[PDB]
Amino acid sequence: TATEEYLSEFWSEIAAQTIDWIQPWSITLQGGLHKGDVKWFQGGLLNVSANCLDRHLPHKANQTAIIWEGDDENQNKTLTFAQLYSEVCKMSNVLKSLNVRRGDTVGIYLPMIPEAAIAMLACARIGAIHTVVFAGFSAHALQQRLIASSCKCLITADAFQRGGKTIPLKKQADEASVDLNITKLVVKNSNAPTALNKNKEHWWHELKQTVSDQCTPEPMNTEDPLFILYTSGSTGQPKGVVHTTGGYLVQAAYTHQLIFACQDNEVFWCTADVGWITGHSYVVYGPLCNGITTLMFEGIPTWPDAARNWRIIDKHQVNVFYTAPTAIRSLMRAGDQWLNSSSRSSLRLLGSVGEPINPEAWNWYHQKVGQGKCPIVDTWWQTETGAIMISPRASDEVIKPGSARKPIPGIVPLLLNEQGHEINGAGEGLLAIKYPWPSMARTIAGDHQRYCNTYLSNGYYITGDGAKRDEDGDYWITGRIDDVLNVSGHRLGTAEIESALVSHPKVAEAGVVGIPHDLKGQAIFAYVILPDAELQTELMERVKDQISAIAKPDVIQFA
Ligand SMILES: CCOP(=O)(O)OC[C@H]1O[C@@H](n2cnc3c(N)ncnc32)[C@H](O)[C@@H]1O
């Protein structure tokens, strides 16, 4: 109330400093968490791509905007801001010549190549709502998101390299799009010939030549939807988490600068795929809005070997490195010897996102990777918060391995006890947020009631996480207290694993849970009510083909 005026005025001041406005706003904050009618910067006009491209020209026109490294180490690309601006303007005009209009949903099924950032930004320039589907998702998983989003246009690619092997991405898109009325825009990511159906599918490198390189950015309302991310929950199939335009970009860009403090001459490398929220906020939108060079890597941390990340960090002089504890633990399982070939002297800051980091992995990250010279910002947040919420600062003394420390400014977390009351001082319980914040997800696509029932309780936002808070006010995130899983860094739901199992003809009922696993964090344990080991393999095969390899059950227990 009075607190809300303080938060309103704080965020209003951040919005006017952080991003360019086509038109200023008239009401900073409106609505709240009791009703779930939160509105930020109502009356304002802006465009996300203008903040990430146009406004950096021409002073940073020749600064590298995106460094790209291929799974094959000999494959490298850079795009300056001027180059990236023209690529986005062209793909905007290509989408409009394909009938994509403001407020249409556009599907994106791309690997970590520059065209993934261009596709997102091009949707943002024209007011389309992109829905990025993780390119490691199977055809069935892609297909279910295309039906749920009702998108008429899908941006995808022929193939890409992961580890040694080629991933047939276009075949999976075709399988997913069979009985749907989808126009495909296809990026040629191979030197190998590919044959398209000319009626409904188009080559990007051809259509780019049919359109102008200038495209006026849409003047977007702050509450226009920017994108949908299909996200696993504790009940049911993944739901479409809707983020809007104004508050999302304000807090994504502000927290990127507040936590990582990159200067115009530095290289920032977050390893998250664009298919997850971390890829949205801290690979594409946050860094490019701040005018900071961001790095996109196509492959995996262990190919050709467990030294790959540091060879990339030395090759491009990465200064800030932001990755997941699953990757940290697997590289330290590989052995400290893989740290001996590199220098890593360009690094000044390490980051951790996506799951708790245990002290053994924090110390290995700090002493060995960072050589003792880098703070570790352990950032807690979620898809539904849109941006970092609780995090150490680089400026802070380096202490408490495994603690996310204090909320960022303008954010009020709290703990609730088993009877629903707010815990004062030191304790533990349910992690919640007390007041609205600019980058909060605004609804579930189609079912705002399911959004309110799932996230809003007695005027608070319910994270679904447990936490401790010590005598200093520092937070310690213990993990999901609901049924949501964290498996090798991926947020997963039991419902999609259960239905993928039961759709097998021999399976009648299934029950999936998570058990502790040292390398994966959680391993997927499935109870299956059908009887051999041959069937365990085909039932693990069923889950990989329905969802992804990441969701494959690690133990199948027949009941
Ligand atoms: C940005 C990823 O967003 P999501 O994929 O939506 O996962 C969100 C869920 O990951 C977990 N989590 C994320 N960061 C941390 C962290 N620093 N320490 C501990 N746990 C963390 C937590 O359970 C949260 O609710």
Breaks (C-N over 2.5 A) in the chain follow: 530
CA of 82 to the centre of ligand 1 (A): 35
Which residue's alpha carbon is at the smallest distance from atom 4 of ligand 1? 382
CA of 466 to the centre of ligand 1 (A): 11
Cis peptide before 401 (omega within 30 of 0): no
Burial 441-453 (b: 16+ CB within 10 A, else e): bbbbbeeeebbbe
Q: State the helix-helix crossing angle for 169-177 and 139-149, rounded to 10 degrees.
A: 50
Which residue's alpha carbon is at the smallest distance from atom 11 of ligand 1? 355
Instruction: Classify 412 in phi/psi space as left (phi over 0), alpha (psi -120 to 50) or beta.
Output: beta
Name the residue among 137, 124, 81, 364 with its Cα closest to residue 273. Answer: 137
Tally: H helices and E strands in the chain: 16, 31
How far from chain centre, in Å, is Cα 531?
A: 39
Tokens 């999901």, residue? 480
Which residue's alpha carbon is at the smallest distance from atom 13 of ligand 1? 354
Which residue's alpha carbon is at the smallest distance from atom 7 of ligand 1? 382
Residue 352 CA, closest ligand 1 atom number: 17
Is 547 in a helix, a strand, or coil?
Answer: coil
Q: Angle at the Cα of 287 (from 17 to 329), degrees rounded to 5? A: 130
In what helix (H) or strand (E) does residue 5 lie, and over which residues does it extend?
helix 2-18
DSSP 232: -
Tokens 């086509």, residue? 22
Residue 84's identity, in one-letter code, is L
- Spatial separation of the C-alpha atoms in residues 205 and 382, rounded to whole Å: 36
Residue 391 CA, closest ligand 1 atom number: 17
Question: CATH number for the domain including 230?
Answer: 3.40.50.12780
Name the residue among 519, 521, 517, 402 with its Cα closest to residue 467. Answer: 402
CA of 54 to the centre of ligand 1 (A): 32
Tell me the pairing of strands 475-480 and 509-517. unpaired
Which residues are within 8 A (CB) of 125 and not within 5 positions of it... i.e. 6 or more apart?
47, 48, 49, 50, 88, 89, 92, 215, 217, 218
Containing domain of residue 387, as a range?
1-391
| Residue pair 251/409 in contact by the 8 Å Cβ criterion | no
- Spatial separation of the C-alpha atoms in residues 70 and 163, rounded to whole Å: 10
CA of 324 to the centre of ligand 1 (A): 10
Residue 464 CA, closest ligand 1 atom number: 25
How far from chain centre, in Å, is Cα 307?
A: 25
The CA R_g of the chain, rounded to the nearest whole Å, is 23
Cis peptide before 304 (omega within 30 of 0): yes
| Residue pair 256/267 in contact by the 8 Å Cβ criterion | no
Q: State the helix-helix crossing angle for 114-126 and 81-97, rounded to 10 degrees.
A: 60
In what helix (H) or strand (E) does residue 454 lie, and over which residues does it extend?
helix 448-455
Token pair recorded at residue 301: 């941390």
Burial 17-44 (b: 16+ CB within 10 A, else e): ebbebeeebeebbeebbeebebbbbbeb
CA of 477 to the centre of ligand 1 (A): 9
**Residue 308 to residues 75, 92, 297, 434, Cα–Cα distance (Å):** 14, 35, 11, 42
Which residues are within 8 A (CB) of 471 and not within 5 positions of it... i.e. 6 or more apart?
425, 426
| Residue pair 462/433 in contact by the 8 Å Cβ criterion | no
In what helix (H) or strand (E) does residue 239 lie, and over which residues does it extend?
strand 239-244
Nearest-10 Cα torsion for 188, 189, 194, 198 = -30
256, 277, 350, 355, best to mutate for ligand 1 pocket (most atoms within 8 Å of CB): 355
Token pair recorded at residue 292: 């900071």
CA of 476 to the centre of ligand 1 (A): 12
Name the residue among 136, 127, 181, 179 with its Cα closest to residue 154. Answer: 181
408, 477, 487, 522, best to mutate for ligand 1 pocket (most atoms within 8 Å of CB): 477
| Residue pair 232/496 in contact by the 8 Å Cβ criterion | yes
Which residues are within 8 A (CB) of 421 and not within 5 positions of it... i.e. 6 or more apart?
none
259, 381, 383, 454, best to mutate for ligand 1 pocket (most atoms within 8 Å of CB): 381
Residue 276 CA, closest ligand 1 atom number: 5
**Residue 129 to residues 145, 215, 352, Cα–Cα distance (Å):** 14, 17, 29
* Beta-bridge partners for 557: 527
- Spatial separation of the C-alpha atoms in residues 172 and 156, rounded to whole Å: 10
CA of 354 to the centre of ligand 1 (A): 4
For 387, what's the count of Cα atoms within 13 Å in the CB-facing half-sphere? 30
Residue 484 CA, closest ligand 1 atom number: 23
Helix (H), strand (E), coil (C) string for 304-332: CCCCHHHHHHHHHCCCEEEECHHHHHHHH
**Ligand 1 environment, Cβ below 6 A:** 276-278, 353-356, 378-383, 404, 463-465, 477, 479-480, 486, 491
